[PDB]
Structures are given as structure tokens and as C-alpha cells.
Design a protein around this nucleic acid. Sequence first.
DNA 1: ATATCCTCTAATGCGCATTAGAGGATATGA
Lengths: 767, 882
Amino acid sequence: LGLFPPTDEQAAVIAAPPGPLVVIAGAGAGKTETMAARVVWLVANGFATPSQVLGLTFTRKAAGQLLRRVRTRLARLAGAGESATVSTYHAFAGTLLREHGLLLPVEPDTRLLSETELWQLAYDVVCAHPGHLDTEKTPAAVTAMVLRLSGALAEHLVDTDQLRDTHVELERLVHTLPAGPPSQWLLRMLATQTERTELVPLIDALHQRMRAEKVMDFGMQMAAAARLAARFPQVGEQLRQRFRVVLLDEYQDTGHAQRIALSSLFGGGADDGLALTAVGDPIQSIYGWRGASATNLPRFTTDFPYSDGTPAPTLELRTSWRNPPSTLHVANAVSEEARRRSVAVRALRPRIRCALLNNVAAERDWVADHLARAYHGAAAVLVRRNADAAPMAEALTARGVPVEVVGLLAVPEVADLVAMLRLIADPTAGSAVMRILTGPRWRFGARDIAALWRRAVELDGTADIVAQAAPDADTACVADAICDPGDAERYSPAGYERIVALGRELTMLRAHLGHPLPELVAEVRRVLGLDAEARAARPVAAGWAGTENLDRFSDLVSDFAGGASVSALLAYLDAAVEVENGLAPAELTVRVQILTVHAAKGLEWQVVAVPHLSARVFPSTTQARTWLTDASDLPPLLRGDRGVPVLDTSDIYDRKILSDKISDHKKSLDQRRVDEERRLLYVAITRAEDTLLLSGHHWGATESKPRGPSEFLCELKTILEEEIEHWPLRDQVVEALWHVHRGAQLVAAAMGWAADVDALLAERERP
Amino acid sequence: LLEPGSNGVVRLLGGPGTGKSSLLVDTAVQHILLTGSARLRTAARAAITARLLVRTVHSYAFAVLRLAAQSAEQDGIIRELLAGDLEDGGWPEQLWPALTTAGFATELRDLMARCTERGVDPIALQRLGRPEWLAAGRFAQAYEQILGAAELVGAALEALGADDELLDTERNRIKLLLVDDAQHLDPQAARLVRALAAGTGLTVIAGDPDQSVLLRDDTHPAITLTQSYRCAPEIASAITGLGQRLPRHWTGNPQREGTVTVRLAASTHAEGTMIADALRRAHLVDGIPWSQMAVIVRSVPRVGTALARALTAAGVPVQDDVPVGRQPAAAALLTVLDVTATGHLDADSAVALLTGPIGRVDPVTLRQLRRALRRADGSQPPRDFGDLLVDAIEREPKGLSAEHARTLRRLRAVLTAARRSDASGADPRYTLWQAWHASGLQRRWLAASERGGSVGAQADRDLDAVTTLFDVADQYVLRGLVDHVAVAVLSVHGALAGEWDFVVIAGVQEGLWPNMIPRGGVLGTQHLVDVLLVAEERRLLMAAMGRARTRVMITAVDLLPSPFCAEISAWATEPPLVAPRVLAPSALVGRLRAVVCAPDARACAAAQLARLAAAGVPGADPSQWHAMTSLTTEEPLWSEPGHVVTLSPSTLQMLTDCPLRWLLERHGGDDGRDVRSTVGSLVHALVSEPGKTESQLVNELEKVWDDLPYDAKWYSDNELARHRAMLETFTRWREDTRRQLTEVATEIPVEGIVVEPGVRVRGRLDRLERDEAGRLVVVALKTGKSPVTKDDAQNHAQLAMYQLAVAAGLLDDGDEPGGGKLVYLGKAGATEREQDPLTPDKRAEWLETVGEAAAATAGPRFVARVNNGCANCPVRSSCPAQ
DNA sequence: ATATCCTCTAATGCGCATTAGAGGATATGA
Ligand SMILES: Nc1ncnc2c1ncn2[C@@H]1O[C@H](COP(=O)(O)OP(=O)(O)NP(=O)(O)O)[C@@H](O)[C@H]1O
Ligand SMILES: Nc1ncnc2c1ncn2[C@@H]1O[C@H](COP(=O)(O)OP(=O)(O)NP(=O)(O)O)[C@@H](O)[C@H]1O
Ligand code: SF4
């Protein structure tokens, strides 16, 4: 219908008879392309009504694009010979809870918590625990463990009861058993195991408090929906009647809570007339730590049966479409080890520049040069660590290429609103005064800061020491010298008028502290220069948009106070800074992209480079801990989808055997993460469409000894050789010393915008 | 058909805005009624009085019920019934877990209400059996055996037809029946009207069957109307074009000139901005007054909440939520009432009075008041501010009072009036009003609401809350009294009684306006309603569009435009906006500045900015730009010849790391003192004593640990158990090295000169000891957990300054270099990091480093080198190097 | 004028526990 001619292999998937179906073979063989084109075949031909279609995707952008593609195809087919419902998994779980929330007793009016509010609630519950933890950690550091255990449990449906017998049956092997030849090291593992059962009451009280306040989380909604699906068969028999065709995209990364909720409503072996299609490959399953389900590709042929025991069919659909050769050879050779570990695919058939520089600066220069010579004379880069994203723009901006890189509270126009709101609330935050006193407004000099501090100190055993640190102790802050500057002989004449103006402004603004919260942040922004200087710092090519995030902050403040502005909205923002790493960047309208590998799933670009491929950075062997070292790890004996082998613990008669078993268990669990990293590299490579860039560096940034290139580079060099011949760290330290002027002259000499200006003048001068 | 001499039933039909109500009032006047809303009846009565029994259906039902005698309460009743009906053992045996929930009560009440509306008996519901409906009917029949506003019409009708004489008398007492609203009338009201219109006179049933007595299927002659009188022909054309898709012909007013337009955004902010842009341009350029525009949205909570906030920022007024107790202004008197009831002033109940509206002090004035009060009671351990506050309120402190006396006097007056007036009169007449009169909070807002749109708004809202609290107190007749306590954006359903020259239909997205959200449930209420939709929402869109006579603006985003937008675009009279223009006075200045200061039209923009600045418009003058400001001082910190600077040894490794960090970490710039700092200082003080045993130190620590600001009281015991071990390991270390060194002084003050700009070292050595060789080692006890490395501890700036002082006299001993030690209490014993004595070769290097560091604090323009310690410094938001 | 840390790993001295230093403190839907 005016689009691609469907291939012979895709033809079978396109017009497959109603019933469960699996699609495989991965990296460009036309999976999402045979979704709208299969909906239209099941709509225009017949067999369904386009109000009975349900499609599920992980990210909401994919849901939106699928909806748009489907509607466009349907509209085009309406001219030759009631709309679908497309939503993400968690949104559908929320809808299911809203419809049938009274069966399983959860109020349908239940609110959903963010990450910051969840952290605040968990922190209060942890700090309000009457008992004796007997742990060496701190609050806000065991909260980061409670919030992780309570996520893993609700992800694997464990309900905190079986967790109380985890250390038992294991501590006897280290005490009762005799040595064959305490070890001072197994005791650390035991002290870790005795931490889950120690903190079970914390994650019980947290759940109780969340229930008592009619709020839940992202990770509890799916658990509740799955329990509702499994317990009550009366909900599936209604949705199956409402929906006749169901599409499950990106099914490789779906979790365990979403696997028994999508197998109880649809395809529990109940109806063979429901056209149910699932797509995905077992090789691009990269998360492993979020959905924590390496299964669900093999557990489909026995999970959605024909209502008579026959396994559902899987169609190969092998053809390489989005991958040119000489970049598909690398993709099919770098993941050739999956011929044993995760066997569910055979191969796919078809329709490069590598560098090893001796330091990070040279590699940055090399990638920037290669990405500029294809721009100046006439794309994306995939960084695994987003902290590495911003660094590699200075070596690229100097080339002249326009630079696009992808924290709400760190924006220079919003960070001056969080301050001067912290200065108003408590006059003891000295870090919110140095930001105001030294900002572009009222640039105070060093001598005047010293004079202010001298006035501040002028204004000012073993029990007098503890007499401090009280909430009402005097600490000689600098915010009460602005309001009592003293005699105007210690400051500069130009620095006393500014001090008096600041004092009067703060005095006016502090009286507006009993007013409603949303009407205070909108008044400070009025008093400050914001909403005018924010626009004046924007290029003419942008247009009129200068207050996007500066307005979304006010919207978020109003959402929060739906409030005290001292106890709240300042502890809340400091919690959001450390927990959410800035609330939400307030994305632009929308150069070479910058995004991370995990955010580059199921997409395509022209020139894609995986820049940093040295050791310890891309494989990321650091900060990985098994289930026997940290408490919040959910031992595999009670985790769903048990890859993730379980140690037998029933064939040990001496301590040496137990030590060997533990060691090989740790080695296996580490090889699991290595395989996940290889899958990540496979995902990164196949997004090419064209020439590809692979690079690695010898000397990093903060290392006493050089680090070699990773195993990925050492394998890709062999692959390309069967490549650019590019095969005392540093002590330089950067330091910074503590148009507008030209354009101001025209305005100074001056004394369809004319109509607007005269209308505004008439409005202002008409009392 | 409409004459004083007439009989029978007549009706007039069709047309939105045609003048049905005007025709009805004209017939009523010419012959010498019903309205359907408590607000519409006022307008009808006003019109009738201007031209020369205005009631509603429920009011008429109540009146007839009263003559026949010659909502939280129902929710509570049903909740109590549900709570009772769970211990006894006819629900379908699956609804037991949900019975105690608050979401089942609302659904059950709604099901009962919709059963009542259609005129259904509980036995009739029990005849529908699906055991859920049987149980609901049994619940309803039990509820009846145990009145509201939902069954009022039904009860009134049931009371009728039995007397057989009241109905005839009422019919004879009515000569004209004017319902004025029959398009949306409940069947009980319809049959009540039909019975009341058996014979009389009359009995006009006008209504409007196009938008869902009876009209569609009935006898008697009917009148057809076609001229709208309140809609432009283009608007009517769009409405009828939408109507030719519904399972109806009328013309607008030809004298009007209209416009129907469709707009699409690129973001939610874009839509919320162009709506305000259009409203502002319509008010200012076109010149129509306020209250003639309106924004109509499907649901106020879903969309209107953010739209109003994004719209009021552009200068467009909105005519426009919290309980009486939750208002701080009303709670100010509630706290006074509570204090009077108790009779004693609490500690946390005084800061609330000092902060609330009764006496207002900003936090800096709180610090000043606290300092001025603590200067009276000069105890060595300062007393808690709350404790002094009550004493100051009760007894006047003569030590010092300059401007804080007025606030305390006002609080004295309020409290001394309230606490005595309650020892006689009743609460509402002697507590609240006497407190209000005693407080000066009536002559301020009265002269302050006149001026200022910001302070005046809070004054008005606070006064309204105070009046509401007073009314509630009056309706409550002291402990029991305290215990008991413009453009108008609105929903489609509220958009049915407006003129609204300009209507902006907002939020017409494909996800919300055609409501794909299912309307099912557990009780199956909708199945009962249907047994006993896109085309449905099209009528709502039609009704919303028909309220506007001049301009309709249908706004959506592209979050996706619904097919209704495409349908409307066929009868309308461009890429979506991404940067929509505004008429805001703070946006014109921004755009003009952005275009002037760019890498032809510059002269025009400069002229516009000059004209703006000549009449105010903040942000316009070149001197008011932020980038054009100048440094205040730009003069060195010290310049006199022969000046000597003082360097404490703890802030030398910070001056050789980042001089800006030194400048701004001191001189204010540290946002506070953590508990770890005071705990370390306390342990240092305990250790510093020279004649105390370990048990004495532990007891002293335990006696004062209680007064520490630790949250998580399970942590305030772990910390105590850790620092007891800290003291124990210090004592073990001291006993271990007794035979190898020997202490000479403890906490000895170091002060002197090391270079002649001169450098004046000043500090407090923690422990000074001496060896068998006569040297003087230096010990700096540290309570940290992670010791520094040996290759770094040999370059420690703190110790290298201490053993620099011991050279050339200073500490009044043999003046030998000695050595250096760094003991880490906490982490076989306490870990000790050593440092060799200052050799004459290295002493020169350290003197050079001290001299170079002392010259970086001289003038302005301090350097900010990036360190490995940038992750811990509070001065980061003001650091240019980031 | 007074101090960032948890954790995993490598050397080492009397095969295994103790001490010291280097490097990272990921990737993140709804
Ligand atoms: N019949 C076809 N003719 C031409 N191009 C096709 C055809 N089928 C698919 N493609 C292209 O091949 C690529 C496959 O991508 P897409 O259809 O989005 O599924 P996909 O990329 O494989 N999703 P995933 O496998 O999960 O990464 C796209 O660039 C399609 O436009
Ligand atoms: N003869 C007339 N001369 C002048 N204006 C008239 C005349 N008849 C009606 N109008 C005007 O028409 C309007 C009457 O609208 P109205 O009676 O409210 O119709 P409606 O049926 O109530 N539509 P609705 O508001 O949805 O209920 C008013 O603005 C009257 O001023
Ligand atoms: S962040 Fe670094 S450079 Fe900036 S002030 Fe702090 S220590 Fe100095």
C-alpha cells in the first residue's frame, strides 16, 4: 500500500493464522515493521475491528511511534477498501488495577510515588524504627538497601516471608563441618546473609506505611497486577473478550512480574481465537539487573499453548536489513560465543575504522577529527558511562561541529532560584549566599566579602561544645550581616548601596513567606531578573522560547504543594539532587548525538562510534557484587528465572569443598555479567547503517599505571585482521581565575514589534 | 398558541441560544414556572422583575412534600452498614476483602443513586438476577428500613396519588407551567411534570432535544425555531458539519461575523502559551473586555490545573480549595484558643505564634530576637529558645528590648485577653472575637488590601478564611470549639450558561476527549444502567462549541490530535508552533535584547527598547542588564608595606590546593556544621584532659551524649558504642608508647612568626611529646576512619607547619625539629602515620611553599585550581572552573 | 584552627590473616 514490498520470510509472519506466535532473529530482520503491517492485515482483510487491538512496548516513545504508524496505515487503507489502544506495560498494569482494584483489595484512587518521594518515605520509616539494628552502616545508607530489597522482592513476588530462613541451613556448613586441612572470610559472608533477615522488619514497616497512605510505586503496581491476574481468572476472561489481537514488542527484556501477568490473561491455554504475537531476540536482552529475566524467550513455547498442549510456533525470519556487510561480519563474530550459552537463534544473512591511542586526549582528538571531516567537507556516539559524555565535547567543539549532548536544578537560570529561596528560608546556608553575592547581579568584590564576614563575626569545656549543634545554636552566619551592615565606612561606597538594596529586597520578600507556596516561587522569580534575562541569553535562531525549564520548575513546585518551603521543597530538592540526579532536564525541541548505549536500543543512525573501549570502562568489571557480599541481592534460591545457577549446598563434607563451591559460584555469577556486557557490545555495534568507528586508549585520566584496552578491542583487532594502524600519565591541571557591550551602545544612543510595544505602553499607562 | 386565552400543552423545539427562555418569559409576562438551577432562577426572577414563583424541580419537590405534611451523612450511614455487614455470615463471597475499603462505598452509593433516578424499587433490582445486583438490592431494601436529595422527587411523587385531593388543588393553583429545561431531566421529574400538567390553563415543555416532559416522541402541536440569535453563521456551519456524522438544521445570526480555527502545538508548554497569547491579543488588540473569553476543557483536574498556572503568568486574570483548619491564618487563632483551653503556654506553641500572622518575624529577626533574649540570662550553657520565649512573653526582660518589645506586647495583649475572657463567657462570643479585637490584625489589612496586588491577595484570602472560621464557630454553638475544627477555565458541563464571545476548547487529544478509558467496575454499574461512546462525546463537543458566538479556537498538541480535529478542519475558516509569541511585557524586552545583542533591524529593536525604558518596563535600560554590572571594590585585601598575614596550620593544605576555596570556605560559605564535627570536637575535649582515667572519660561522654542532633535513635547508640571504643583505643595507644616518648604539654597554643609578607602561624597543638634524644615530636590526634597514605603523610602541611614552629623557638623548649606523628583513633592498635623531622634541606622548601601560599591571599582575582577534593567543597555553584 | 568513605585487591611475615594503597563510587521505563 505504497510502502516496502514485504519479503517472503516476512510474508508468513504478516499473514499468519490467528493464534500465538513468536518472532526471532534479532538485529534488523523487520520486527516492528511487521507490526502495523500485520495490524492492517488483521483489520482491512477482516478478523478484527481496529478498536480491539492492543499493543505493548517498553518505552513510551516506541508506543507513540507504533500508534502513529498504525493510524497512518489505517487511514491510507480507509481510502481503498474506532482506534487502537497502544500503551506501555506499566501503564497497562495501572489501567488493570484501576478497572478491577477492588477484587484484590487495593484502592483504585492509589497515588504513584516518584523516586524522590519514595526515598523520603523510606528514609523516614528507617529513621523511625524502634529497636536495635546492630549494623555498622548509617541511615540513608541502609535506606539504599531497603529500597533495593523491596524492589527485588516485588519484582520476583516473594512477599518478605521466605526471606527469614536464608542464613539458616547455610551457617551450619561453616560451623558443624570439619576442616579438611572459620577462615576469617566466610564470616563476612555470614554477616551479610544475617542482614537480609535483620532488615526484613524495615521493608515490612515500609510496605505497611505505603498501604496506610494509599500510595504505591512503579515496582509494586506490576506485582499487584500480577497477583490479581494469577489469583482471579475472572479478569482475563473479560479482557480476552474485549481485545482480540495483542502485540508484545521487545519481549526479550520483560521481567518476571510481567511474565505471569501476560500469561494469565492472554494465552494461559484458554482461547485459540486471540491473535497474540510476541517479537524479540535472546541476544539484545541487555538489562539483566532491572527486569532480571534472562528467560521468557524459551518459556514461551510452553507458556502460551494452543489450549491442547501443542507448543506455539516460532518463525525464524532471518535477513539482515539495517546492517551493511563488513559491519555485520563483526556483529556476527563478536557474539559467536552465544552458540552454546543462550541457544535460540541460528544466524542472519545479509541483503570500519579501529584505533588504539596512547592517551584519552588523542582518542578524543581522533574521534572528533573523524566526525568533523565528514561534516566540514559535507550520526551518534555511544558512551557507556554518561559521566564520560560531557568530557568529550571540548576536543570536538574546537573542530567547529555543532555540539549536542544528552539536571533541572543545575541550570544557571534555575540554580539562582533554588538559592535566594534557600537564603530566604534559613539564613544559615552559607553556600546559597556566595552564589548570590558573587553572581552576575551585584558582583561583590573580595574585599567587600571580607568586610561582610568581619561584621558577621562581630555580631556574634565539654558541655559547652555539645551546647552547639542544637537546632537553635548561633553559628555566626553571613546572612545576618547583610541586614545589619553597620557603619558605611568598612565597605566600598559602591558596595554599601548594594548591601542596603539586598537587605531591603530580602525584607520585602521574607514577609511573603506565609503566602501559598506556588504564589511565592512565582514572586521571587518576579523580583529577580529571571524570565527576562533568560530570554536575552538565547540565540535569535531559537525564537521566543527561553523559559521552558524555568517554567517547568514552577509547575513541579505547584505539583509538590498539591507544603512549607522550609521543611519541604528544600529537603525535597536536596533529596532529588542526590537521588534523581536533577529532577528532569526539560528536554529541548530538537550536530551528533551523545546518548548512552542503554538508551540506544532498537534505533538506527548513519555514523555511530563506540569511543572508549579500554579495560575496566566498557566491560565495567568494577562495582559488581554477587548475592553473598551485599544484603540487597535476593539469593537465587528464591528468585524467579533460576540462568542464575543455584549452589547445591548438599554435597559438602569439608570446609575446603565449601570454599571451592563458593568460589566457583562467584566465578559463574561474574561470567554472567561478562556475557551481559558482550550482549551490550552486540547491541551497540548493530546500529551502524554505514561506516563505524572503534577506539581505545592506553592512559586514562586519573591512573598511576596505564590500563590496557579491553578484551573487546583485543577481539575486534583480531576480527578485522582476519584497521587504522594507530596501535607518567599527566600532571596538567586546569584552573579558572576568579556583543552585549557592543549592542548596549545602540540602546544607549537610542534615547512587527512596534504594534506590540505601543499596545503594552497603552496597557501600562491606563490606570 | 401563546395567548392569555389558551388551553392544552404546547412546546417549542430546536436551536441553541435561539431564545427559548426569552420566549417563555415573554409568554409569562403577556399572560399576566421552573428554571432547573439555583443560579438560573435568580436571572429569571431578575428579568421578570425588570419587565414588570421562581423555583427548581428539587425545590418544587421539597415544597410539595412540606405541604403534604398538613451528603456526608449518607456516606457515613452506608459505611457503617458495610462495617456491620462483615461479621455476620448476601454478597457473592468474593467482595469480602473490599468491603472495608473506602472505594466500595462510593461505587455502591453511585449504583443506588442511578437505580433511584430511573425509578427502580429494591425488589425490582432483586428481580434482575448475577448475584452482585441481588446483594445491592438487598442492601438498598435494608437501607430504606433504616431523607436525601437524590430520591426527593421520587418520594414526593410517591406521597402524591394517594390523597387524591392535594394533586387537584395544586393543579387548580397553577395556571402556567414553564419548565424551561427538558433536554436533561430525570424520568422521575418528567413523570412528575406530566402528572402536574394533566389539566390546567399553558404547560410549555420547551427543552432542546438536539442535545441530550418529553420532546422527541409526543403529541400536541410543536413550534420550530431556526434563528440562533447567539451564534455566527460560520460556527453554525461547523456545528452542522460535525452533526452530519451523528446517529438538526438551524441558522445563526447573519448580523454576526465569526471565526472557527484549529491550532496545534509541539508541546504542552506551546499550547499553554499560545492560548494565553490569543487571549491577551483578543483583550488588548481587538479590545473585548474580560469575562467574555472562556477556556473549556473536558476535565479541570486533568488539564485545567496546569493550564491556569501557565496562563496566569502571562497577565491574563483568572477568576478562580483548602480546609479552614489547614489555613495558617485561621490556625493562628486556633493555637491561641488551644493555649487558652489548656491554660499553660507550651514550648512549640510559642514559635508558631511568633511566626504566624499574629506576630510576623522573618528568620533573621528570629536570630536577632534570640540573641537579644539570651543576653539577659547569661548562663554558660545557653538555654533553649523556647524556654526563654515563654518567660519573655510572661515577664518583660529589662536587659535589652528596642524593637522586639512591640511584638511581645501584642502577644501579651492577645493572650491576656483570651485567657481571662474564657473564665466567664462562652467560647464563640468571648474567645475568638475578643482575641480578634485584642490583636491588631484588622486595621492593617483594611488599609493594605487597597494597595498592592500581591499583599492584597493574601490579605483578601486570609480575611475570607477568618470570616469562614467565625461562621463555623457561630454554627458550633472552648476545648470543643478547637476540637471541632476574568477568563474562567471550566469543564464542559459547567460550560452551559455563558455568552463567551471567545471560546478556547483546550485538550482535544486522541487519548482523553474520546474517552477510551473503560467505565467498567466490580459491581457492573454501567451494565445495569444500559440494560435497565464517540457519538456521545460528539454531542458534548457540539454543546461546547455552541456556547461561543464570535470566535472558537480548538487547541491540541502534536499527546496526539484526535480525529475530531481533522473533522473540524474541513469547515475551518501550517507546521505546529514550537516557539509561540507572547504579548507579555517581560517577553518583548527579552526578545528585543536577544535580537539587539546578536553576532538592519538592530536600530528598530534599539528604538523599541528605548521607548519601553522611557516608561518603566523593568529590564529595558542598558544599566539594568545583568551583564553590564561592575565589581564593587576591585581592590586588594591588604596593601600596606610590611604587612604580616596569619596562617593556621589546618588551612595551609587548603591554600596550596585552591585559593578560591580558601577565600570562600572561610568568610562564610560553609552551609553548616554536621554532627560529626561536634562529636569529634567533644572527643578531642575529653582526651585533652591530663588527669582523668578511662572510666571517667567514658562516663563524661555518656552523660552528654544525650544532647546530640541524631535522627534514627537506633544510630545514636551505635555512635556512642563506637566512640567509647575510640576513647579506649586512645588510652591503649597512650599506655603503649609511654616507655618510648614522654608528654611535655597538651593542647599547647602555637603562635609566633616564621618569616619576616610575614607569616604568623597560629594554632593549637593537640599533643606535644619529647624523645630520649631531646627532640620534640608533634602529635595530631585524628578521629577519622580512612588514614592518609605514607607518601602523602610525609608531605602533610599541618604537621610540616607544627614542626616548622618548633624550629626557631616559639614553643619555649630546646627548639629541635623533632619529628611528626598522626594518630588515627578508630581504625592491633591505633594506626600511626609518621613523618621524619624537618631537615635543613626540606625546611627551606617548606618555607618557600609557605611564602608562596601567603602571597595568594593578597589581592583580588583568586585562582581556582581543580583538585581531587572538588567533590566535597560547598563553594561549587559559584566556582568558575566547576 | 580543628578532616570524605565503603570496598575489593595486592604485598607479606609468621599456607593464611594483617596492612596498605589504587581506583571507582555504572548503565536507569513507567
Ligand atoms: N521489507 C523491507 N524492505 C526494506 N526495508 C525493510 C524491510 N523490512 C524492514 N526494513 C528495514 O529494516 C530495518 C528494521 O528495523 P525495524 O523494522 O524497526 O525492526 P527492528 O529494527 O529490527 N527492531 P529490533 O529487531 O528489535 O531492533 C528498518 O530500517 C526497516 O525500515
Ligand atoms: N426577540 C429578541 N430580541 C432580542 N434579543 C433576543 C430576542 N430573543 C432572544 N434574544 C436573545 O437571545 C438570547 C436568548 O438565549 P437563551 O434564551 O438562553 O436560549 P437558550 O435556549 O437558553 N440556549 P441555552 O443558553 O443553551 O439554554 C439572549 O442573549 C437574548 O437577549
Ligand atoms: S570546586 Fe574545586 S576549583 Fe571550585 S572552589 Fe571547590 S575546590 Fe576550588
